[PDB]
Design a protein around this ligand. Structure first.
Ligand code: XG4
Ligand code: MG
Ligand code: NA
Ligand code: NA
Ligand code: NA
Length: 314
DNA sequence: CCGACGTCGCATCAGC
DNA sequence: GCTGATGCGA
DNA sequence: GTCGG
């Protein structure tokens, strides 16, 4: 069904990027995902329509695609200069639907036009521009291992009591990642209580961290690069998490996004709620955080077969 | 018919 | 100067 | 755009 899901993803992008209709963006994604998992070749819109997330308007477009191998709206929007320029610019990290509109309105449409107009870009955007190609390359696990080796080593160096845990697709054992996600704790930061700055500073000292998109007391977002053809520049996030909310942190930032969604809806059916900090019991009556001393406890609570990070794709 | 559609930390903007 | 709203990327 | 109160 690849043709149909490429069509739907491309509509979703225009809804988000150009139309600024986030809810139609999500509805097309929701339908692209349920169509992706469906083990038959779709022969009719009405057959699609059986699936949850596929309604009458997507059914119509499936039929037009089946009968013609395209949609008239999509062909038109691609041949539209304004729209397709707005869509493209949002590929720069730090340029969203709003900024891209503003650039395009004032004649700024390509990376070329962005490279000529630095004065009109915020700091995040300049970094996104500067690393445009690099931020779209993937990261083989062998480099993620090398990035990790470095991260754990410098972290332990600053203070032996830190615990650093690489999460995201890495922890799930993916053969390649889009980026590095790192979680951080320390005995002297819990909910009852420079810890991130010091780590970031050390990783800048040894030339691992090359730029900074944003930085606060608990969330850093930035760029790194392995030491030396020189490696691509890579996205890295580091979050400082309360030691006593550690396991909820690791679950959430281990993901995937789609597994967390799943686990959060199941947590509804069994009368609990889960964010990155806590699991709390719910008549909608979300009370106090529960004790947690393993990822498993969180599965124990909502009665779910514990799952290996390995198996948290869906 | 019409409201819901996750939540979060940080940077930047609007407005007093 | 400050607070609160919004943009952005998860 | 899809769903469901
Ligand atoms: N609430 C929320 N959480 C998210 C979202 N996206 C991701 N997460 C959570 C779930 C993720 O597990 C975690 C890391 O975010 P990523 O680095 O963008 N995704 P990953 O590491 O899994 O894949 P790769 O890096 O290979 O692209 O953050 C989101 O949109 N919303
Ligand atoms: Mg990641
Ligand atoms: Na349906
Ligand atoms: Na962007
Ligand atoms: Na990430």
């Amino acid at each position: 069904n690849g043709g149909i899901t490429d069509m739907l993803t491309e509509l979703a992008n225009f809804e988000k990027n150009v139309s600024q209709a986030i809810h139609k963006y999500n509805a097309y994604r929701k339908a692209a995902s349920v169509i992706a998992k469906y083990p038959h070749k779709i022969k009719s819109g009405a057959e699609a329509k059986k699936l949850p997330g596929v309604g009458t308007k997507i059914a119509e477009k499936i039929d037009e695609f089946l009968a013609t191998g395209k949609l008239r709206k999509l062909e038109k929007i691609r041949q539209d200069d304004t729209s397709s320029s707005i869509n493209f610019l949002t590929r720069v990290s730090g340029i969203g639907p709003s900024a891209a509109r503003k650039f395009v309105d004032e004649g700024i449409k390509t990376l070329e036009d962005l490279r000529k107009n630095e004065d009109k870009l915020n700091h995040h955007q300049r970094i996104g521009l500067k690393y445009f190609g690099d931020f779209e390359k993937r990261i083989p696990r062998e480099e993620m291992l090398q990035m990790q080796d470095i991260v754990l080593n410098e972290v332990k160096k600053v203070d032996s009591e830190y615990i650093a845990t690489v999460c995201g697709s890495f922890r799930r054992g993916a053969e390649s990642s889009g980026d590095m996600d790192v979680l951080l704790t320390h005995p002297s930061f819990t909910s009852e209580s420079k810890l991130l700055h010091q780590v970031v500073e050390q990783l800048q000292k040894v030339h691992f961290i090359t730029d900074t998109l944003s930085k606060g007391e608990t969330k850093f977002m930035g760029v790194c690069q392995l030491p030396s053809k020189e490696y691509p520049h890579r996205r890295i996030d580091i979050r400082l998490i309360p030691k006593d909310q550690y396991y909820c942190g690791v679950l959430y930032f281990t993901g995937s996004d789609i597994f967390n969604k799943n686990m959060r809806a199941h947590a509804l059916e069994k009368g609990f709620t889960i964010n990155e900090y806590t699991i709390r019991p719910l008549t909608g009556v979300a009370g106090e955080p529960l004790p947690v001393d393993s990822e498993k406890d969180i599965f124990d609570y909502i009665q779910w077969k514990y799952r290996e990070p390995k198996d948290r794709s869906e």
